[PDB]
Design a binder for these strands. Structure first.
Lengths: 74, 88, 76, 90, 76, 74, 88, 90
DNA sequence: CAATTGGTCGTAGACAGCTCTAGCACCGCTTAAACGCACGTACGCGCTGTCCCCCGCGTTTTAACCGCCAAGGGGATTACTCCCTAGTCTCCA
DNA sequence: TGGAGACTAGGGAGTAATCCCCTTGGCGGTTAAAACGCGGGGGACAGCGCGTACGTGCGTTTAAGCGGTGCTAGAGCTGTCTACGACCAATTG
């Protein structure tokens, strides 16, 4: 994994608090969410790098994430 | 199939505004689609819990899953305030 | 907080994505994309847990929530 | 009749009959089709409420499929439900 | 042939898409995208017709083929 | 519609020939395919125009269709 | 559930190469997924034709629909040359 | 036994038993589970054939999930089946 | 000619009871990983310029569209009527 | 100690036989729409320059991770036990 596990667990337990208070998570639910979130972010930066090369650049910019998410339908 | 009730709700929501004949087929395919989507989601939820009876609770969960956000909150509130008015 | 998704963890995700150089404003946008992704998946995982009359979000509720986005996850 | 008794506009017995002919389960519940008919009734009375609001906002008399295509892809309230739909317009 | 998708019909589709100016090589690429889209949808429509033991591809086979791509079509 | 109907019917009847020979089409199946194909192409050129603006251009090029289809997953 | 047969096919395809314990759970979730996808597609195809019996023909069509291209041609050829070897 | 009789490796009776407990229809066919077990057998003997080809091509002894993730996203033969899958690797 | 209301009859799900995983919590010590500088240099971004190459306006050419009328393939149906799938006794590891 | 071989008793589909929509196929005369060609000029695309701003390397600060106790909530049962939904006999429009 590439994100640290304890701040990602704090992030899931502070996002899920808005949906139902006082929830518990299995130890493998947080690792499934962390595996799916890095498999989402790498697949997002692979299209952001395509949108940055498309403009004849190397540095990715927030408009490249915004284009890769508007084309994808997000 | 469901075209006779689309005009009946339209008489309540807009008793002055009429509807076309292609738009009735569009609203009838919309209703048969959101029906065969909600019932399909509630059958998968009845299978994931190894139940056999689709209750109103699997419909409330399939509405929470399918409809995003405020549409799910209002469809759950309308289904709840229709089942409670039904049992009374 | 969302601040736990640190600067070098986003940099490692971009280095694995193939990005050579990262602007200084990607870091707060990527956290805003990750928070939307978690707010979309955890809502469905909490919906499956409240439907299963549980209080513990198992990993199969997360697999079902990712399956409802076209992101099937094998291994749980 | 349970539809007037529940003060709804869709027939519960036809949605239940379509759940039986769809064979979505082996046995339904007592109040599951009332809930499903009230949610589909809400969605129809939310889409046609906007089609009837837009026909009189534009000045149209009837409701054409062009009104449905303009509303459901506008109106971010329910434009998310129709991200991947296409009204045929023919 | 694919050549029936003419130059000004692709230009009208791009003018409706909001494109102001079109390069001279879009015309053969757009035909190659349209041919892939039809080869993906007609394969499923012919599969539903051969499954229904028919020889006439009805419009509900096309609606089912578009439904299997997340492109639900209302009005048929 | 924006594509002419008879060349689009010739296109469908020459694409479907590779799948099953001697097929017949309803008159509304071809209009559903033509409605879906223009609703596909306009939605494709709306992301191609975003990929062409992203490079600080106005003219769309085949690399803009190729980027809008690689990000979309085609 | 299906983990006892994944190793049995692996003994035929590679009698020398072994498999891990996480990879067995991955292949078992893969098999239970392509099973609950093919059977779900064949139940929708049994509903679209208003039938009641899932025959092998709704499985051959759900394989043609789900698997793209050459994988569908080889899965149909293997299912056909297994049903014919079964009836004989 | 019909699996050896059909000269297959998956059990037809367990796939049929999972179709009964899934309640995918009301009644199956005589040869529908043999066809479904031969297709799932083909897909397993096509994925594990490549995992066993790659373990000996790389030089590995066992089959790890890293081998599955490298194969199913390579090998354009079946990379289309796994466009939207994610092997967890944990 | 609907959809409904009294009875009835299994049986699925509600539901107290209980075992025991496992999630949450805290303490302490490592040691990696993050964090804050300062500096140099890549590389975005603005600018200017030559030059394709796209758009717009005319002709002229094509073929799509429309309105006929055949003609036969083939949905869609109604009727039987066999041939299947759903209930039950044993072998051979 | 689990299948699956012979026999029942039905009851979806196979399979004719039948209308009759409707798809495909001509012709012929339109007139819109595509196709070609010319020319002018917008605007990709290359090159250069100034200068932010990102990366690398340092020292220092934080905290995540790990190992080790607790400890109670709450998943999973197992066994009852009602209330439930599936069946059947008179109706306000």
């Amino acid at each position: 994994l590439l994100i640290r596990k304890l701040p990602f667990q704090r992030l899931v337990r502070e996002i899920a608090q808005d949906f139902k208070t006082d929830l518990r998570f299995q130890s493998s639910a947080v690792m499934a969410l962390q595996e799916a979130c890095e498999a989402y972010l790498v697949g997002l930066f692979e299209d952001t790098n395509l949108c940055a090369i498309h403009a004849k650049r190397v540095t990715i910019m927030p408009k490249d994430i915004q284009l890769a998410r508007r084309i994808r339908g997000e | 199939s469901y075209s006779i009730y689309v005009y009946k709700v339209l008489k309540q929501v807009h008793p002055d505004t009429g509807i076309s004949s292609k738009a009735m087929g569009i609203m009838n395919s919309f209703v048969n689609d959101i029906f065969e989507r909600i019932a399909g989601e509630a059958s998968r939820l009845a299978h994931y819990n190894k139940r056999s009876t689709i209750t109103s609770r699997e419909i409330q969960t399939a509405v929470r899953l399918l409809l995003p956000g405020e549409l799910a909150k209002h469809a759950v509130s309308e289904g709840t305030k229709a089942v409670t008015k039904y049992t009374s | 907080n969302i601040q736990g998704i640190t600067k070098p963890a986003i940099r490692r995700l971009a280095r694995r994505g193939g990005v050579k150089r990262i602007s200084g404003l990607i870091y707060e946008e990527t956290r805003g994309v990750l928070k939307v992704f978690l707010e979309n998946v955890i809502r469905d995982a909490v919906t499956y847990t409240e439907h299963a009359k549980r209080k513990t979000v198992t990993a199969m509720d997360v697999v079902y929530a990712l399956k409802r986005q076209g992101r099937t996850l094998y291994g749980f | 009749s349970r539809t007037v008794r529940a003060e709804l506009s869709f027939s519960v017995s036809q949605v239940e009959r379509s759940l039986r002919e769809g064979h979505y389960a082996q046995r339904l519940s007592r109040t599951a089709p009332v809930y499903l008919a009230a949610v589909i009734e809400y969605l129809t009375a939310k889409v046609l409420e906007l089609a009837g609001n837009e026909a009189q906002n534009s000045g149209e008399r009837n409701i054409t499929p062009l009104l449905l295509d303009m509303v459901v892809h506008n109106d971010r309230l329910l434009s998310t439900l129709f991200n991947t739909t296409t009204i045929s317009q023919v």
